[PDB]
Structure 1
Amino acid sequence: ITPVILGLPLVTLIVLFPSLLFPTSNRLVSNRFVTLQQWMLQLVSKQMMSIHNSKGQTWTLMLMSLILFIGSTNLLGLLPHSFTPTTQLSMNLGMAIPLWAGAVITGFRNKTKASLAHFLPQGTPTPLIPMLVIIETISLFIQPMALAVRLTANITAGHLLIHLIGGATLALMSISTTTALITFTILILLTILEFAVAMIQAYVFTLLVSLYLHDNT
């Protein structure tokens, strides 16, 4: 109970302080405190606003909240353990429904039979062939939305394997460290090359998909 109950509040609160702190920065103080934190939403309003609108300012902050939430949500599966294999996976699955519903909000909710009528009328889906449209609604949503869960689960995986292989590698070479440290130092750096890149591009998928929504919206 406590374990599951403590994690979700923490995730909210880490987003809540930035989401409360930025609202606060609109007049005081700033001292060290307010100006320091302003940089947080300055990085969002710097980085993501280079891509956003795009779809229009209207949707921009709506998506940026999810983009930050995904990266922050994955970051809230970074540190905790046991958590990446379970809680971040339940958060990957807990983001799964939100990812499914993200196409629902405008696509399947307004048009289930052809949410590609909002997403993509002609492209991937054949506008002459509503069948190919709907098939690829899987690959553009029903799928990719579950793969986007699998995508963060891929990271959870490859991250889990670093861990199980690491624990197994250091169980194999329990030298303290020593030569297993060399490989394991690589396996650590592979966490950046794998998870930290692919986790990025996983939210880049949510960025682009919710861009293609609202860019055609």
Structure 2
Amino acid sequence: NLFASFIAPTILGLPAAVLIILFPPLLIPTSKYLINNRLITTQQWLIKLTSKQMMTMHNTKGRTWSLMLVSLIIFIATTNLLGLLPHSFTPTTQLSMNLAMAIPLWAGTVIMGFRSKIKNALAHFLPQGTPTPLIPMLVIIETISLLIQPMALAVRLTANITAGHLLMHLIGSATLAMSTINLPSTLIIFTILILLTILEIAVALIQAYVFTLLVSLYLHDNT
């Protein structure tokens, strides 16, 4: 009854969760022209400013992912922002979807660190200026954290959009309860919901930039 906005949506027995995951790309029109409209002029600028941010820090092999790590910050920042609409089912609150964006991009990042350049990837586990006599303890950290980075991504994003929606939905129910009670209090609980919606707008973008930065930093440490 409380987690209702996270159950897979179905209308007329049809799994409507597919027309919701495939919609974000519909808000990004493209054109071959040279001078287009305001939408594609602002979007092609954001993609320019974004790609120059995540990708500048990479070498030539890391920059071959400049289509992936840009088409990923565009898909997470548009799925989150389409979740703040009323009653909307944002599929980034799903541990299934988030585990499907996290494991491949991570596994495909350490594999290229183990299928090639492996002898160099063996040197990140042991920092440069490290004395020896307590190495058999540090080996646990750099591996067990590596083995849990793919689950850090998918849960840092799941637990931040879920908890952001749960809070806005509870504080919302508060204003509904104090509506039939002292009303000058309703307006102070509501203005908390407004400052909270401006926060959930920012955390809708920040959680997209951090997800695609930590996938970038994993890549930078394997190319």
- Shorter-chain TM-score: which interval? 0.7 to 0.9
Which structure would you say has the larger Rg?
Answer: 2
How far 1:133 moved relative to its partner? 1.7
How far 1:74 moved relative to its partner? 0.9
**C-alpha RMSD of the superposition:** 3.4
- Paired with 2:108 and 2:151, the residues of 1 have a C-alpha distance of 17
- Paired with 2:150 and 2:196, the residues of 1 have a C-alpha distance of 30
Length-normalised TM-score, structure 1: 0.72
Helix, strand or coil at the partner of 2:22: helix
Helix, strand or coil at the partner of 2:57: coil
Residue by residue, what CA displacement relative to the aligned partner does 1:138-175 show, whole Å, maximum 9, x if unpaired?
45x1441243234xx32321332222232133213335
- Paired with 1:119 and 1:191, the residues of 2 have a C-alpha distance of 44
Length-normalised TM-score, structure 2: 0.71
Corresponding residue number in structure 1 for 2:202: 197
1:187 equivalent in alignment to 2:183: no
Corresponding residue number in structure 2 for 1:15: 25
Of 211, 218, 222, the match for 1:213? 218
Higher helix share: 1
1:39 equivalent in alignment to 2:42: yes
Of 67, 72, 79, the match for 2:85? 79
* Letter of the 2:218 counterpart: L
Corresponding residue number in structure 2 for 1:62: 68
Helix, strand or coil at the partner of 1:155: helix
* Letter of the 2:75 counterpart: F
- Paired with 1:166 and 1:121, the residues of 2 have a C-alpha distance of 47
Looking at both structures, which has the greater relative contact order when contacts are Cα pairs under 8 Å and sequence separation is at least 6? 2
Distance 1:119 1:27, change over 3 A: farther
1:117 equivalent in alignment to 2:126: no
Residue by residue, what CA displacement relative to the aligned partner does 1:100-143 show, whole Å, maximum 9, x if unpaired?
2211112158649x9x93894445xx99543222122145x144
Distance 1:17 1:169, change over 3 A: closer
* Letter of the 2:110 counterpart: G
What fraction of aligned residue pairs are identical, expressed as a percent? 33
Of 82, 89, 99, the match for 2:93? 89
Q: Does the CA-based 8 Å contact 2:172-2:193 persist in structure 1? A: yes
Which runs of no fewer than 5 residues in structure 2 stay unpaired?
1-9
- Paired with 1:2 and 1:110, the residues of 2 have a C-alpha distance of 45
Of 134, 151, 157, the match for 1:149? 157
Distance 1:122 1:160, change over 3 A: same
Q: Does the CA-based 8 Å contact 2:76-2:208 persist in structure 1? A: yes
How far 1:26 moved relative to its partner? 1.9
* Letter of the 1:149 counterpart: L
Residue by residue, what CA displacement relative to the aligned partner does 1:75-100 show, whole Å, maximum 9, x if unpaired?
2222151525xx4422x541222112
Distance 1:159 1:10, change over 3 A: closer
Q: Does the CA-based 8 Å contact 1:63-1:207 persist in structure 2? A: yes
